[PDB]
Amino acid sequence: ENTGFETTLIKGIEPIRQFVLAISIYHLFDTKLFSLLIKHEVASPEVACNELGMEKEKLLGLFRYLKNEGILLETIDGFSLSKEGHALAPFEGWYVMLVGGYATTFLQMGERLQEGAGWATRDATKVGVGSCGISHFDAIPLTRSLMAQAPGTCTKLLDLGCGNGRYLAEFCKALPQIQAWGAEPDRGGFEEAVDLIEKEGLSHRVHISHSGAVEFLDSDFDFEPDFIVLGFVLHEILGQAGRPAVVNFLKKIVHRFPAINLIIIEVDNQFDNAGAMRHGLALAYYNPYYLLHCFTNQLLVQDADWLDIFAEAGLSLVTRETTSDQVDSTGLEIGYLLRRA
Amino acid sequence: ENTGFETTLIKGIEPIRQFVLAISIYHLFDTKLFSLLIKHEVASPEVACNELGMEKEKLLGLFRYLKNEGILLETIDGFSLSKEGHALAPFEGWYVMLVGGYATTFLQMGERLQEGAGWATRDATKVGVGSCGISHFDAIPLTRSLMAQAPGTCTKLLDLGCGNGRYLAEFCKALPQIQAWGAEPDRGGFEEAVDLIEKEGLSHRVHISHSGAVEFLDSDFDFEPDFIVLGFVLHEILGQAGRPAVVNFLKKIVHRFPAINLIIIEVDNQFDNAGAMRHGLALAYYNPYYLLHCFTNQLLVQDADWLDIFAEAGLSLVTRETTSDQVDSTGLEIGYLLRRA
Ligand SMILES: [Mg+2]
Ligand SMILES: [Mg+2]
Ligand SMILES: [Mg+2]
Ligand SMILES: [Mg+2]
């Protein structure tokens, strides 16, 4: 008879309902429909189609789906973002990083679980673009706070793994004397960085290279930085190349630039910490982030493990801070300001 | 200052938290880890790895992620499904169909919105396997109810678009005199059907063909069915081949088999119906289902549109029913029992 089945089904597939909604919100941002709705206020499918080069019947389908979920309103004049839709605006970076960048990674987990199946791949351009959007709220303010605590003033900034160059665009706008260099290994991300720097009118002060971190430090670049920022880059090197390679990379930075100030941002691996994992943001963001990092060739370690790598590399801790508790109060995102020992 | 941002972020990315959970629940079923946990009760990662040929560190990552979400329990002896994990068991078909089958389809929507970009693709094997799992609850009981209302007893059953052959396996077990034939166009689904029929010991009574519906009816098969089941197949033909092709296909069925009883199951397209779309199941399942059908080459129409196609094909409605209100009370899944006019 299946007595009471429907009520259990509606609850049982609530993760699928939200799965489709998350992908649909990601497309709303990524296709530039969200920005179109912000600019137009109300747009007919015909107007949105003409502007973005889209097909009306498919756009109507997406719009009707979002209207049923309350993200859009529909009037005789067309569609608009509802208050709930407008409220999604600050979270674009998270949708672009985790859906755009990592949907394929999560979908590959079943196959990648097999012995010898290798690491899950990702869309590194979207990971970089999304992570740079997120960084406006957490990592850039943390980097700024640590930079201000350093004894020397920043004049020549090097950002390795710069994504779309958001840290450099923000820092250079705020601090007009700075000359900067960024390196980004993903071609798509590198091209977005070159474009963002040009759009911000910073091309005369900021140069971007298409390069990985280790290979950039081995290259024959002429820059003499006094600050180097390593935002979530060391855990990539640690997984890909190993702990000796991370220690050697850090040793090379202070051998080449003995007076340099290093700012490292890392995620403390507390995936196995009961209390930490009950925090709302630990569940919403860090639990999927830790899962991705078991399937990709990156390795997250604990705060104590990073401090031990820094000591082995001959670095001294100046200060360590976490993000503002107004944005992320988990204590899992840690920033370190270091100097040569 | 970003005052109060974190609280808004946790709510703002709740769809992403559930997006990752839905994919992870899908892998738990699809990889056979869910069945392993049911059989073992408690399993160490080492034991699960040896049985399924998996890598321990990746499995531990998935298990830790699911434990943090409350799907698994961890003791010194290993991992087990929690009560919440056990409660997911009946919903396997929905995860396999919508995540396994259609995740790629949803992820393709951004690109497919572009003028001339074509139809989004899907993993038809997983769509078929998942939809057959769902059919145990809604469409098979509906088909059984309509068959019982037909004047003649079923002796030779033809099921077009049979997926993994679940309708035939269920009907033939319940009704021992039946000879049956199934046709499934997806090779993966066809192979699963051949295997399920063999596993159920029905190979002497049930034959499966790797064929689409229209091409099967045009073939030189020797079967003389007295019942034909078209479960969610006509909307595929309607989208792919057009309304005249659907009318012609139905006309061919009753020209070849004048005394045949047809059972058609369709989804009423009420995507634009305010009241219908507020039902919990309309939001959880039908709203994503309607969205997929705007991006794939299938077309959902309304109950009245199907009745008009049946009249044009020279068919008479014997009776029409919806699914049991214990499983799906939306009224959107409609079954029709037809005969030649
Ligand atoms: Mg990372
Ligand atoms: Mg890893
Ligand atoms: Mg369909
Ligand atoms: Mg269609």
Swiss-Prot record, chains A, B:
Superkingdom of origin: Bacteria
pH dependence: Optimum pH is 9.
Swiss-Prot/TrEMBL keywords: Antibiotic biosynthesis, Methyltransferase, S-adenosyl-L-methionine, Transferase
GO molecular function per UniProt: S-adenosylmethionine-dependent methyltransferase activity
Species name: Pseudomonas syringae pv. syringae
UniProt note: phenotype after gene disruption: Disruption mutant cannot produce MeArg.
Name under which the protein is recorded: 2-ketoarginine methyltransferase
Gene from which the chain derives: mrsA
Role description: S-adenosyl-L-methionine-dependent methyltransferase involved in the formation of the rare amino acid 3-methylarginine (MeArg), which is used as a potent antibiotic against the closely related soybean pathogen P.syringae pv. glycinea. Transfers the methyl group from S-adenosyl-L-methionine into 5-guanidino-2-oxopentanoate acid to yield 5-guanidino-3-methyl-2-oxopentanoate, a precursor of MeArg.
Alphabetical GO biological process terms: antibiotic biosynthetic process; methylation
